[PDB]
Amino acid sequence: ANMISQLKKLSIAEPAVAKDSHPDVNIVDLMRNYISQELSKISGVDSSLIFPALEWTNTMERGDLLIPIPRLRIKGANPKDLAVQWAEKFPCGDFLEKVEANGPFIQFFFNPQFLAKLVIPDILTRKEDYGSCKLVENKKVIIEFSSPNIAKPFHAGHLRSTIIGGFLANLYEKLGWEVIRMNYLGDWGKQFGLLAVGFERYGNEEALVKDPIHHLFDVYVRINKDIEEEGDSIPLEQSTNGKAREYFKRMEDGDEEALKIWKRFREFSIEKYIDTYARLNIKYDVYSGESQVSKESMLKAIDLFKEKGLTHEDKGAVLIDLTKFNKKLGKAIVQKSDGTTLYLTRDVGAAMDRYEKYHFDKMIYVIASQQDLHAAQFFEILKQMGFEWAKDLQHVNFGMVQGMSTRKGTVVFLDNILEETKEKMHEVMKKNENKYAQIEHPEEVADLVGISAVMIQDMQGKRINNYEFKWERMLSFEGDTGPYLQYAHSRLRSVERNASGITQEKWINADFSLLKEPAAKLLIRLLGQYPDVLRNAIKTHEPTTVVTYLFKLTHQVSSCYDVLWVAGQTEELATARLALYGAARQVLYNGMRLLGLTPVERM
Numbered sequence: 001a002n003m004i005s006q007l008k009k010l011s012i013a014e015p016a017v018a019k020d021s022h023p024d025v026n027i028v029d030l031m032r033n034y035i036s037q038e039l040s041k042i043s044g045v046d047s048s049l050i051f052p053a054l055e056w057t058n059t060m061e062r063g064d065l066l067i068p069i070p071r072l073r074i075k076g077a078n079p080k081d082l083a084v085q086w087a088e089k090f091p092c093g094d095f096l097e098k099v100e101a102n103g104p105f106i107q108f109f110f111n112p113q114f115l116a117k118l119v120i121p122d123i124l125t126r127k128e129d130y131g132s133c134k135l136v137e138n139k140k141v142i143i144e145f146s147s148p149n150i151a152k153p154f155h156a157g158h159l160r161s162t163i164i165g166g167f168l169a170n171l172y173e174k175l176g177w178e179v180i181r182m183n184y185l186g187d188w189g190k191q192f193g194l195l196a197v198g199f200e201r202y203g204n205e206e207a208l209v210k211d212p213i214h215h216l217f218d219v220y221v222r223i224n225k226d227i228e229e230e231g232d233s234i235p236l237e238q239s240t241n242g243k244a245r246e247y248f249k250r251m252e253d254g255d256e257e258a259l260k261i262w263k264r265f266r267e268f269s270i271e272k273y274i275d276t277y278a279r280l281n282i283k284y285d286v287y288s289g290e291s292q293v294s295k296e297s298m299l300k301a302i303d304l305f306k307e308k309g310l311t312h313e314d315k316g317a318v319l320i321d322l323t324k325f326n327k328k329l330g331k332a333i334v335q336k337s338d339g340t341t342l343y344l345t346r347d348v349g350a351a352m353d354r355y356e357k358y359h360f361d362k363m364i365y366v367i368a369s370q371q372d373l374h375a376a377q378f379f380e381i382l383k384q385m386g387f388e389w390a391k392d393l394q395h396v397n398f399g400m401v402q403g404m405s406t407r408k409g410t411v412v413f414l415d416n417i418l419e420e421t422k423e424k425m426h427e428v429m430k431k432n433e434n435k436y437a438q439i440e441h442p443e444e445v446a447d448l449v450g451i452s453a454v455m456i457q458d459m460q461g462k463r464i465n466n467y468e469f470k471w472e473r474m475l476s477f478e479g480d481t482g483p484y485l486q487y488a489h490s491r492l493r494s495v496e497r498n499a500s501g502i503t504q505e506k507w508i509n510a511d512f513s514l515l516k517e518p519a520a521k522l523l524i525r526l527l528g529q530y531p532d533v534l535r536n537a538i539k540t541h542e543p544t545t546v547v548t549y550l551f552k553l554t555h556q557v558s559s560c561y562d563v564l565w566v567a568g569q570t571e572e573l574a575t576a577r578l579a580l581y582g583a584a585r586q587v588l589y590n591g592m593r594l595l596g597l598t599p600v601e602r603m
């Protein structure tokens with residue numbers, strides 16, 4: 001309705017549309033349709049095989065898309081030969097600049113001017129929706145992430161889960177899904193009765209509201225030191241552990257104030273978190289939890305366990321031998337001796353709840369790889385319980401952040417304190433580089449840039465890999481860091497030099513043929529790839545791809561600054577260049593937001 005329309009104007013036939021491709025919002029799909037249809041004619045290979053066979057190129061010097069011929073699986077043919085042959089009689093006509101042969105590979109080069117005519121206009125038009133696409137129709141996904149425990153440490157694990165999840169949610173949306181961002185709070189268990197008993201003994205009602213997360217934490221720490229100083233010959237009823245297990249007796253019974261106090265720990269906590277998450281551009285839809293598991297599903301679950309015959313007691317505890325389904329798993333405990341539920345069981349139940357409540361098409365749990373088996377288990381259990389949707393569950397894991405524990409006394413503890421230390425460290429960091437700051441709101445910018453630093457550093461490599469939290473390296477404006485993207489966005493933004501509504505309009509009509517410099521052709525190539533980048537990332541749930549793409553973008557824009565000057569040029573030239581810079585800035589903006597960043601715009 002925009003790129004295909006442009007095609008009409010330019011009077012160019014649209015190649016056959018492969019099923020599920022989206023040439024309207026992804027010029028690389030358009031290009032894929034053209035190549036498959038035309039390469040299909042030369043060879044005896046149906047385009048349904050070529051389309052998926054087209055791959056990205058390691059470097060832009062090897063083309064835009066290529067095909068390892070052997071992957072086409074053509075009987076008795078010499079790939080080296082075919083490549084040379086096809087690259088010869090292959091029709092570039094209006095779409096490609098050239099087609100080349102490199103061993104058993106054939107490489108395709110898009111027409112830079114063709115791209116410009118469609119890509120720049122499309123970016124400037126759809127703006128913030130540029131990378132968007134509807135590769136999905138009426139599909140709902142639940143993405144559970146961060147999920148800290150109340151009164152307990154919000155460690156690096158939670159942080160990491162928080163960052164990946166926030167991004168996965170944004171990604172899933174720009175790709176057409178309906179997203180339910182859920183935060184499965186750790187807010188139940190004997191530990192809360194203890195907490196309740198502790199708030200009584202050392203708690204302050206005013207401190208609870210001023211700072212629920214910190215106060216409750218400090219309260220928990222204190223009530224524990226009592227549990228230790230006791231334990232011996234102390235009436236195991238007037239003891240702390242006693243009143244804890246007793247005060248917890250509110251799961252069987254109701255109100256008894258036993259809940260009024262707890263429901264406030266939870267709600268006041270959630271109210272604080274909401275502001276904190278806002279700094280990471282995350283707004284949860286549902287603040288669920290282990291406590292929020294329906295009594296119905298919990299019982300229905302324990303029930304179905306036997307109805308299917310998976311249970312088998314041992315030492316007085318109920319277990320499920322997943323061995324026969326996957327030796328890698330094991331005899332998972334679902335109910336211990338004292339006839340009480342476990343962490344694994346609350347997850348089995350919570351799933352059951354979430355399904356009947358949302359009837360999701362897919363559910364994603366962003367949990368550390370430390371809990372791999374945990375997930376793998378209640379996934380295999382939900383399966384044997386019959387529930388079909390179990391196949392629609394997925395565990396997106398990740399390695400651990402190391403050396404982050406800045407708290408000189410222990411592990412990082414409170415999320416907001418993290419943001420704060422980052423901001424502080426980035427503030428004095430900004431102070432040391434007189435060349436970058438002249439801003440009016442240092443503090444504010446510091447927070448945004450600081451958070452940018454944390455996010456980028458965390459998403460640079462694969463999720464599964466352990467990475468070192470390096471204050472020095474991450475806050476710097478040097479290498480491929482968060483601050484680097486921010487300052488780049490800022491420079492690009494300034495280059496647009498106030499783009500009136502009517503101005504961005506003349507950009508759309510600029511004479512792109514004036515963008516003949518190679519440095520420009522490379523950026524244009526690059527800009528057309530954003531939609532494909534997102535498409536690939538949801539396929540892997542790896543933000544690296546995006547982060548790597550955004551740095552290639554800023555670096556190319558950097559190369560362009562040296563040659564594609566705007567000031568002092570004729571109007572026609574300046575307009576064609578600014579159109580490019582603007583489209584470039586738009587993509588950069590989009591990509592950063594997707595990752596969870598807040599592009600610094602107002603200095």
Ligand SMILES: NC(=[NH2+])NCCC[C@H](N)C(=O)O
Pocket residue numbers: 144147148149184185186347365367
């Ligand atoms: N459904 C889940 N198990 N979500 C993740 C829970 C993580 C847990 N709160 C922890 O701190 O380890």
